Amino acid sequence: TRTQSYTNSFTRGVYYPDKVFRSSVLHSTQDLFLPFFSNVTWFHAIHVSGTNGTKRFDNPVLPFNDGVYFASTEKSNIIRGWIFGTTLDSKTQSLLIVNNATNVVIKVCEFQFCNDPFLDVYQKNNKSWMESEFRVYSSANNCTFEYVSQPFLMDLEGKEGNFKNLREFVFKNIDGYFKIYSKHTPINLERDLPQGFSALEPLVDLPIGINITRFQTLLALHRSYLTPGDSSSGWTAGAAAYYVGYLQPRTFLLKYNENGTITDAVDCALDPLSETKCTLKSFTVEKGIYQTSNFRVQPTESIVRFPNITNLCPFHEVFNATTFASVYAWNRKRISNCVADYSVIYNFAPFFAFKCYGVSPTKLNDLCFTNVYADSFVIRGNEVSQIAPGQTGNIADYNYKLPDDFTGCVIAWNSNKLDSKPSGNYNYLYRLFRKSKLKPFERDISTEIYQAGNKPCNGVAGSNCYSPLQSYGFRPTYGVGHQPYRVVVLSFELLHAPATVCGPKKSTNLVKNKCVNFNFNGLTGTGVLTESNKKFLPFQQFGRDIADTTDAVRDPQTLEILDITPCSFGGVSVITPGTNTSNQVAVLYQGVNCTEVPVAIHADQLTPTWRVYSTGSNVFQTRAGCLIGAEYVNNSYECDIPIGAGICASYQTQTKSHRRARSVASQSIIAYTMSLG
Amino acid sequence: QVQLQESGPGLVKPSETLSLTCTVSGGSISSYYWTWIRQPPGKGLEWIGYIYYTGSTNYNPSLKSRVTISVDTSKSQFSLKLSSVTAADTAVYYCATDYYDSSGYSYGMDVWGHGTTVTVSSASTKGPSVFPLAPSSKSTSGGTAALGCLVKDYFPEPVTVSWNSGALTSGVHTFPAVLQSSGLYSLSSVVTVPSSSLGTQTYICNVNHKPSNTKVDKKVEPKSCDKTH
Amino acid sequence: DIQMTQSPSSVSASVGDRVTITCRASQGISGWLAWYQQKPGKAPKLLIYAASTLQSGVPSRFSGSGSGTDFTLTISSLQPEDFATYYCQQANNFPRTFGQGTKVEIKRTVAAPSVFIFPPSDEQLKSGTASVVCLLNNFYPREAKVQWKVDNALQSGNSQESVTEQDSKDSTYSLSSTLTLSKADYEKHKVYACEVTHQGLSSPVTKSFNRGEC
Secondary structure, three states, X not given: OOOXXXXXXXXXXXXXXXXXXXXXXXXXXXXXXXXXXXXXXXXXXXXXXXXXXXXXXXXXXXOOOOOOEOOOOOOOOOOOOEEEOOOOOOOOOEEOOOEOOEOOEEOOOOOOOOOOOOOOOOOOOOOOOOOOOOOOOOOOOOOOOEEOOOOOOOOOOOOOOXXXXXXXXXXXXXXXXXXXXXXXXXXXXXXXXXXXXXOEOEEEOOXXXXXXXXXXXXXXXXOXXXXXXXXXOOOOOOOOEOOEOOEEEEEEEEOOOOOOOOOOEEEOOOOHHHHHHHHOOOOOOOXXXXXXXXXXXXXXXXXXXXXXXOOEOOOHHHHOOOOOOOEOOOEEEEEOOEEOOOOOOOOOOOOOEEEEXXXXXXXXXXXXXXXEEEEEEEEEHHHOOOOOOOOOOOOOOOOOOOOOOOOEEEEEEEOOOOOOOOXXXXXXXXXXXXXXXXXXXXXXXXXXXXXXOOOXXXXXXXXXXOOOOEEOOOOOOOOOOOOEXXXXXXXXXXXXXXXXXXXXXXXXXXXXXXXXXXXXXXOOXXXXXXXXXXXXXXXXXXXXXXXXXXOEOOOOOOOOOEEEEEOOOOOEEEEEOOOOOOOOOOEEEOOOOOOOOOOOOOOOOOOOXXXXXXXXXXXXXXXXEEEEEEOEEEEEOOOOEEXXXXXXXEOOOOOOOOOOOOOOOOOOOEEEEOOOO | OOEEEEEOOOEEOOOOOEOOEEEEEOXXXXXXXXXXXXXXXXXXXXXXXEEOOOOOEEEOOOOHHHEEEEEEOOOOEEEEEEOOOOHHHOEEEEEEEEXXXXXXXXXXXXXXXXXXXXXXXXXXXXXXXXXXXXXXXXXXXXXXXXXXXXXXXXXXXXXXOEEOOOOOOOOOEEOOOEEOOOOOEEEOEEEEEEHHHOOOOOOEEEOXXXXXOOOOEEEOOOOOOXXXX | OOOOEOXXXXXXXXXXXXXXXXXXXXXOEOOOOEEEEOOOOOOOEEEEEOOOEEOOOOOOXXXXXXXXXXXXXXXXXXXXXXXXXXXXXXXXOOOOOOOOOEEOEEOOOOOOOOOOOOOOOHHHHHHOOEEEEEEEEEEOOOOOEEEEEOOOOOOOOOOEEEEOOOOOOOOOEEEEEEEEEOOHHHOOOOOOEEEEEOOOOOOOEOOEOOOOOO
């Protein structure tokens, strides 16, 4: 059995989210198919050599990633589809049996047979039972879950004859994301995929997580005869053939019209033409060069390893404590060696303010802060807004005096039902008579009075002196300003030390020789995380380099000198002549050795290794690196596209182009030298 | 949730060295100032110093040039090397966690240990020869019965005398150690037990000694007053 | 070096009173003090740091106040589980000194102990060093004069007492009176009793335990 390979132009597009958008180009990093890749071309033959002998190309294809299963059927060739995990009756199964008025999905662990045939011939008066024949199964077990979906997830139109359908699958643990559509080609050419753009929308999702490692195709026999030329052959000789693809986690681009339809699709890791469309949110690239990324991408799973801690932070003992204190001796309690869970905080009260100066509350959940302090106090209602960076000293800002560079939140809420009393309201006080402005995070517990110039007041107020710590009077007979408000000012600290307070993120495994996403102890990187031999201090983390780019970070659990080298060469420019002129790009390398590309060593579209090639696309060495994709001529022109080191690029036809002659030249890429005249 | 388990000697000869170990279990050594603190018997608390993770020591002017505190960041441990030990150094050493924040706060001792007495002497380590206290018939005035375990002739101070492997909790009394004329301590563990259970439950009295390593047990039974039936 | 000094060395009161322990110093600490607690023999557990801020798991009965040199600690309700020695820790400079200890006592009503004298065990008689113990359980404050008596003759200081600490639940004490004697000193006599002279026990208890008779 010999199989061929066919390419895809622009098909296999799928909506990533489940919402509608209008004039919004969203960029996401998920799993989707790649055009211009090889697809298997299993040619299915329908023949019979006996009553029990059936010949059909039913091979156990291995879906390391999800694959496209086309539906190029005439009437009823493909009706179902099998999915196995081990083919040994050890994992849950799934069947998409979408037949006439019967769309029952069975997910029972069964070991039926090795080859599954399908016919539409009633065995013995099968009009009373279901239309699905009982020759598919051989036993029965405990039924876990079933589906009684009424709508048919199968497009069948026996009038057109051609079936250019697109179907994809998603093997996620959350849902299945079954996307099925159907189109029709206007030309009766061979069984090839037509060119053009197309998108798929989800129809039915399955919340059952099943480990899928083996895939099998299902075909309907529909022979009913043994000799060619009958009412089922010759006139309807429609032995079909289907293709299978594979997924690779890359970055995709999608556009949404005013109605919500996708027009085009751009993959960053296909050609240097499309690399400029991802780094810059645009589809009409201008003439010149741009700074983009190489063909490398991110893998399926990321690494988010955090320090080994299993203790919960005592945030409950902070917010809903029994009794608070006046703001001259605010209760500041540090939190360390625990796991931060910023979810029980919202379960306390309808907070009037949640101003998080510094770290945004979105990323505040997972950053692995060094230490966390919890300052709790009761301030006046209309004076809560003064507890913030800035806010020049008011009558209450001389007690806390938040600094100008704060990296925490300010949670506050009214407590009139726990603090206000008819008589007992003098327990809460505030400092009013101060000498100088306090320092950030500095308390000034004191009972000495302020001398009023004339005579030194020695513990007695008398004529003009006044005792400090005046009462607030938080009685339940005021408005919304003169009410007690319990404020919890969480302050996060980030110093060079092993982190002790992290978010609720699990710890993954270590994958060295792979370009996985770097998320160690809050640091975000996208380089090669492998073993190195750098020199680090014993208790020092988050190492840096001569530049501000993070070069190495020690693992939080098992100390390890692991450096972060970039997955791309970085200095890989892209010469774009414009999406409205041509589609030729000369790749520029900024001071690098011979082309390696560790990720795409032998990709489909490889610009180097084109020494013996005509009409442009040649390799040359420059002072700023290597020039691949153009030619060199001893002529000179203006600054059309600057390459560097006195060399520039220009998109001209050729040096020999006469409009009155019969010799018409191409429009390849040619590079010239710069002249001063 | 940090804990501190202490470990070290119990009897140190004079003029020698003194070193114990407090293992950190509950977090990494990068926040607290894991150090020690001494407490002589029947007097106040005296400090020792503080050692950070970045090798920073600072002792008291009294015992400055007699202690060298160290920290093992690899196995998460820290020890206190006390040289020139004298009779005045007999104290119950504790491991505590101090921390002062950069802004200016001065959080006190949050996490503590359990205490390891360090006696300075040159005597023996007599652990065995513990005797029980059997009850009688006239010792049941009120309905209960006292059951004691006279720990006699034992030099090491720290004892963890329990009852029935930590089962009995009510009535267990631990008297303070008292020195005899020969230099050996003597104690007892009397538990209030009702007379209705003198012959049903077990009366195992455990005695553990860390330097002696003699964790022997013994059962308490009443004296058989009827020598004929 | 700051020398912390505590004025009240022993605050004896009853359940429901308020104890006010003071702590003065030489150099003025701004606001950083601490109060500890270690009841039986354990390590001093922190209660209020920075002299005003309580710690996770500290009852609301404790409350600190003061500034400069004078600092106080006000226990609102004297729960039975409060008998301990409270300390004060200066936490301003590097050398952190402590106080002198405040043995807070609880004054309950008058109680009557149980003697429960232990007869000479036969196991310790084989070695030759026995000791008859006079026990006292659940009585009033430790003020008690336990006098031994052998053959109608008082001893001459050949005994050792061990006064325990006040209980955490019933707020009572305990006392043992070992009578250490040699083999020859524990065979010429037969009468062995401890005279109990307590405030509650008006009549002196003449409970006697003969040497291996009962």
